[PDB]
Design a protein around this ligand. Sequence first.
Ligand SMILES: O=c1ccn([C@@H]2O[C@H](COP(=O)(O)OP(=O)(O)O)[C@@H](O)[C@H]2O)c(=O)[nH]1
Length: 412
Amino acid sequence: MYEVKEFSSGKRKLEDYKSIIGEEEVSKIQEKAEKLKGRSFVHVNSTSFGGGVAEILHSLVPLLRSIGIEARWFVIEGPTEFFNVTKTFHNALQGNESLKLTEEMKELYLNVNRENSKFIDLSSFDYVLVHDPQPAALIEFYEKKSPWLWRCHIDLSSPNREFWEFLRRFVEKYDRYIFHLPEYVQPELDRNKAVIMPPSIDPLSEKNVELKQTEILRILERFDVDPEKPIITQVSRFDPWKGIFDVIEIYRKVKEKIPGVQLLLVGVMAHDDPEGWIYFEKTLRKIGEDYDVKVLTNLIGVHAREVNAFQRASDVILQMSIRAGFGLTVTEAMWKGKPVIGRAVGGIKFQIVDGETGFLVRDANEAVEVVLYLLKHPEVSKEMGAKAKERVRKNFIITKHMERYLDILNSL
Ligand SMILES: O=c1ccn([C@@H]2O[C@H](COP(=O)(O)OP(=O)(O)O)[C@@H](O)[C@H]2O)c(=O)[nH]1
């Protein structure tokens, strides 16, 4: 078990968002953090590099620090055989009931947890937070002296029975279990001690920071995207259930009345995800030689800062997922003042206030209607965008995230 001590984000402090959330709120935050001044608030997880959770901590910890809370972050060390197992665990908890949990696995998992537990005494801290499966087992390698929290960043509505009965021996121990949505909260747990904490976006990260027009245009020009013509965009992983083919249909139908429209299919996927890459090849083959459709991914060098650009340069953003988690991509768009059009699924129905900040549609043709409405009425779009931005400022910002945590430490 290692510690971060540092933070890529830098010396993030509540103050760095004063301009964004206003002083009344900066205060309301500081206040709720006084009652917890000098307390120990540690975070444990499986990596400080790859991942959003990791990216969230690099900003979240510093913040907690600069507000009066001795926040600290520790990571878990392990051999490949441990992460491949946790990958399975991961995929198992998120359905895929074709996975088998063996003893060689439980032993490995539990052992790795034992070892990393003898490096730093976690029971000593006023508050301990454990992120995702990998370090769940930790909770039974110390005598509890303070509350322990389980943070879930995945779906637990339809988990592989075998695997859940095993993890549940650890999760049930913690004082409160935190989930993104009131759907991931397995029944084997006591809803009284469960907590709903949607994830959040950090306004000052590569993905959400405000770029300067010149850079947006450099990126637009680099990937051959015309900022002078209309643009619709769906940022998302490439898989069978993200509505990607529907989007392609929507773009085509819209293109009948607006021949200049361009479609941006944006998406960063890890190299160890053949599933995603096969759906990627499939997309391109369906798109055919229509270069008004841009398929942008990290294979061609698209990353957070470029994704940032594609989103900002967009006139309308889509999210036609058939099955979805929280949908941070929807959150990012909403933050960039863009009106989203998407299916009422997972976190997309929770974030979009239909008719106010964007639209919730049931099919592709309904999505076509609205893409034209919005494209036809830029001022309406501007409005929905402005409201979508506020909703985020007031609900899904990393500072509102922290405040939520505070609310939780003031209820134990
Ligand atoms: O193609 C992608 C897919 C995801 N993300 C990042 O991953 C987060 C969204 O994860 P998501 O909510 O889409 O997971 P899901 O809810 O779909 O299971 C966002 O913050 C993005 O920065 C990205 O940049 N490009």
